[PDB]
């Protein structure tokens, strides 16, 4: 593995000093010996999905998760602030539709939650507006503390919705994200979209959630991510491990469909293309709520702001 | 490893003696060993295919060599019996036509050309005819030793259409495949369809068979078969060490295409849908005469019997 140990540095210009080569290789090798026993299960058909080599490798699931992973999700979600969820195709993805940006990047942050708030913005408005736009992540990060934001120590969509009935939200044109929480620097004459209203799907019903997917446009969700999905490169995710009260990341439903009898939701991140199918993951679809992918969903209503 | 060995012979139907279990299991893990290493290199976008378990795992590449593997090319090809050739789509799939069937699987039979004359037949016909149809493989394999062949000790499909020429090909329902050379059943009655000349393209001219199968439709072809190939799951395959004079294994060119600037060919094997991409492999086209793809191709005029 001598080998790929330095080309998979180069491929993530990954450096390290003495102190610590040796300690990241232990972690990759450890790592890749775990992706490629279960990548020979999904050859024979006893799984369902593959894991792969990424930027994440060199890392333990623990740190992965002290970095970027929180507990999002209260027993008082039951009742929403906004209004809950309840006739779509039986198959859908806003990306043909032109509503999806291409998958961005969350660095050295956990702010995974501010990228599902964009990502969810960007299809209303483009949709509504019938133009291209990109959303200002950083904005949320440095700005949305009032409203019970943490950064890049985690944080809410729907606590973001609340910023954004206020104060209107620039384009990553105007306000570039740089995964280092700031000072807020909102400029009240660059905001271009606020906030109305929004709808929640938070009762674990999937059905809800593909409603409001198909009818409305890509959804902000929440999800249990454990090691498997940190390393997960193709197919479709299942885990019988998760949670669904123990959602810890956000990421944007942008569709669902079926696959050889399989139904599945496709799913946007904010870990770059390096991560999964293109930077997507396709998770299992009604089997449980699997990850909790319909305990904290949302959708805004979106206006011009002003 | 014990429990995949378990299932992937469960899978394949294999059962050893005492005897064969261990040599059996060595030789898979070794194997599994080469697919294991490869496919992380994939990963890292050192190689453009992968590799995967299939039904050869517990064979060496030299036994599964001696099994389904011949020369097939003589220096006499370079002026073929029949017309070589010399306007047409950049990328096309015959099976979009209609004019392939499905992948058959040549079983304990070193039939490859059989197979693949059946194969360039039944996009003649299914073209000319606007019918379904399934040629025999146990025909050839059974009727055509005089015109040199060597039933499932190999063969040419140039030697086939000689036979061709006189008597005509049954359907597989009416002389089905059984994987061992027997008496020749020919019943003229059950003759469907014959062979009136034959195209060519010996030349090592990628360009002359991307317009043969572009024109006129899948090409019977013979390739370099190494190792890798045995594994092949997915992906642009490649090869540094085949040779064009040593193609050794025919199939069926059934398209060509491009994918993120690599251009490939599309081939139809008779390793039943466990082998490759749902039983065909995408190789690289325009770089080489990659293993002898363009050595020993052919595609008969084909008519009614009569």
Same mark, same amino acid.
């Given at each position: 593995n001598d080998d790929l140990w330095h080309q998979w540095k180069r491929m993530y210009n990954k450096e390290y000093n003495g102190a610590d080569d040796q300690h990241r290789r232990n972690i990759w090798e450890k790592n890749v010996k775990h992706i490629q026993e279960h990548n020979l299960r999904h050859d024979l058909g006893l799984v369902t999905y593959t894991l792969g080599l990424n930027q994440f490798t060199d890392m333990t699931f623990e740190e992965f998760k002290a970095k970027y992973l929180t507990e999002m999700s209260r027993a008082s979600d039951i009742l929403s602030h906004g209004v809950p969820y309840e006739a779509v195709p039986d198959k859908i993805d806003w990306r043909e539709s032109g509503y999806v940006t291409e998958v961005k990047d969350q660095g050295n942050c956990g702010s995974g939650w501010a990228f599902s708030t964009t990502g969810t913005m960007e299809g209303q408005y483009m949709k509504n507006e019938r133009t291209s736009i990109s959303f200002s992540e950083q904005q949320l990060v440095d700005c949305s503390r009032p409203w019970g934001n943490n950064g890049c120590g985690g944080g809410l969509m729907e606590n973001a919705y609340q910023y954004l009935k206020q104060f209107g939200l620039e384009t990553?044109?105007?306000?570039?994200?740089?995964?280092?929480?700031?000072?807020?620097?909102? &400029?009240?004459?660059?905001?271009?979209?606020?906030?109305?209203?929004?709808?929640?799907?938070?009762?674990?019903?999937?059905? =809800?959630?593909?409603?409001?997917?198909?009818?409305?446009?890509?959804?902000?969700?929440?999800?249990?991510? =454990?090691?498997?999905?940190?390393?997960?490169?193709?197919?479709?995710?299942?885990?019988?491990?998760?949670?669904?009260?123990?959602? &810890?990341?956000?990421?944007?439903?942008?569709?669902?469909?079926?696959?050889?009898?399989?139904?599945?939701?496709?799913?946007? &991140?904010?870990?770059?293309?390096?991560?999964?199918?293109?930077?997507?993951?396709?998770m299992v679809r009604n089997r449980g709520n699997m990850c909790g992918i319909a305990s904290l969903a949302s959708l805004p209503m979106v206006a011009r702001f002003p």
């Open positions: 990553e044109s105007s306000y570039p994200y740089t995964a280092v929480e700031g000072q807020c620097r909102y &400029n009240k004459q660059l905001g271009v979209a606020k906030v109305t209203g929004f709808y929640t799907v938070h009762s674990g019903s999937e059905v =809800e959630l593909k409603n409001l997917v198909g009818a409305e446009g890509p959804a902000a969700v929440a999800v249990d991510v =454990e090691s498997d999905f940190m390393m997960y490169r193709s197919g479709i995710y299942q885990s019988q491990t998760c949670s669904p009260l123990r959602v &810890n990341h956000a990421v944007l439903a942008v569709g669902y469909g079926t696959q050889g009898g399989t139904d599945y939701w496709i799913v946007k &991140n904010s870990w770059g293309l390096s991560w999964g199918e293109r930077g997507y993951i396709r």
